[PDB]
Amino acid sequence: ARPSSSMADFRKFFAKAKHIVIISGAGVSAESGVPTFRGAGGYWRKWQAQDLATPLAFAHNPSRVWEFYHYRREVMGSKEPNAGHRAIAECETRLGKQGRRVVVITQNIDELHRKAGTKNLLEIHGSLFKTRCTSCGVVAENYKSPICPALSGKGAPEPGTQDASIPVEKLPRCEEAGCGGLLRPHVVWFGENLDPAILEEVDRELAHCDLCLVVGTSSVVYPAAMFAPQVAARGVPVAEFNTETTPATNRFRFHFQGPCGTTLPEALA
Numbered sequence: 535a536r537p538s539s540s541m542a543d544f545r546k547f548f549a550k551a552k553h554i555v556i557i558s559g560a561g562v563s564a565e566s567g568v569p570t571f572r573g574a575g576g577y578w579r580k581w582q583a584q585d586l587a588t589p590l591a592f593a594h595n596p597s598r599v600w601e602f603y604h605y606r607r608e609v610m611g612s613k614e615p616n617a618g619h620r621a622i623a624e625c626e627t628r629l630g631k632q633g634r635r636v637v638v639i640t641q642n643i644d645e646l647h648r649k650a651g652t653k654n655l656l657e658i659h660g661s662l663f664k665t666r667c668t669s670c671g672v673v674a675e676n677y678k679s680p681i682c683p684a685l686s687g688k689g690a691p692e693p694g695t696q697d698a699s700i701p702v703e704k705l706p707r708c709e710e711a712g713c714g715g716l717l718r719p720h721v722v723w724f725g726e727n728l729d730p731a732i733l734e735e736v737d738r739e740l741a742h743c744d745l746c747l748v749v750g751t752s753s754v755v756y757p758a759a760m761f762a763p764q765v766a767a768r769g770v771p772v773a774e775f776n777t778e779t780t781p782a783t784n785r786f787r788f789h790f791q792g793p794c795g796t797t798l799p800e801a802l803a
């Protein structure tokens with residue numbers, strides 16, 4: 535039960551596909567210089583990213599979690615879309631002129647698909663550059679560097695860096711009149727459900743698609759890891775683009791090895 539590595543055969547499906555869903559994970563941004571969760575980039579100070587991206591973490595030490603998110607926002611400041619992001623964006627524009635739909639369902643919070651020009655984007659895990667008020671619930675875009683003055687020069691990643699220990703009053707706060715609630719990043723933490731509206735949107739896309747790509751993702755985090763398998767179970771061809779095999783590889787019709795910045799321009803031409 536094993537995937538094909540034939541691009542020519544994938545291209546035969548691609549030529550006819552009317553409704554393509556492209557699922558991405560951190561590997562799509564690796565060639566932009568954005569750290570992944572797997573490997574060495576997935577550590578900040580002595581923690582793993584899945585240690586800090588939790589409601590318990592935030593409740594216990596919101597300064598520490600904000601220092602972590604600050605660091606990621608600042609990392610992003612210099613980063614640009616790569617050839618894989620661009621191929622995806624250009625594909626959507628080209629096919630759209632022909633009446634054919636391409637939609638990107640990303641786990642990423644890095645906004646690089648946006649910067650590349652993707653329009654049909656579902657950020658299923660939220661965005662590094664939005665806030666949500668824990669008091670009022672308002673969602674706001676926020677690209678400020680630093681997001682608050684007390685985080686200026688904070689966030690360094692090296693193990694043994696002292697906690698900034700910023701009092702909650704000096705962490706990012708809501709600016710709505712009379713609120714002043716503590717902000718959090720408008721991201722999905724481990725242990726938190728996705729937004730129901732997002733689940734519904736995904737469900738509609740997967741049920742309607744006739745071709746699916748699964749790009750740069752380890753296929754370990756749920757529910758997102760369920761998505762491409764479900765499409766394959768329907769009998770729809772799924773093509774995995776990854777520098778390695780994953781637990782999901784053998785569920786799919788195709789496996790294209792190598793950096794997606796190389797393979798996606800070729801696939802989506």
Ligand SMILES: [Zn+2]
Nearest residue numbers: 667670708713
């Ligand atoms: Zn508020």
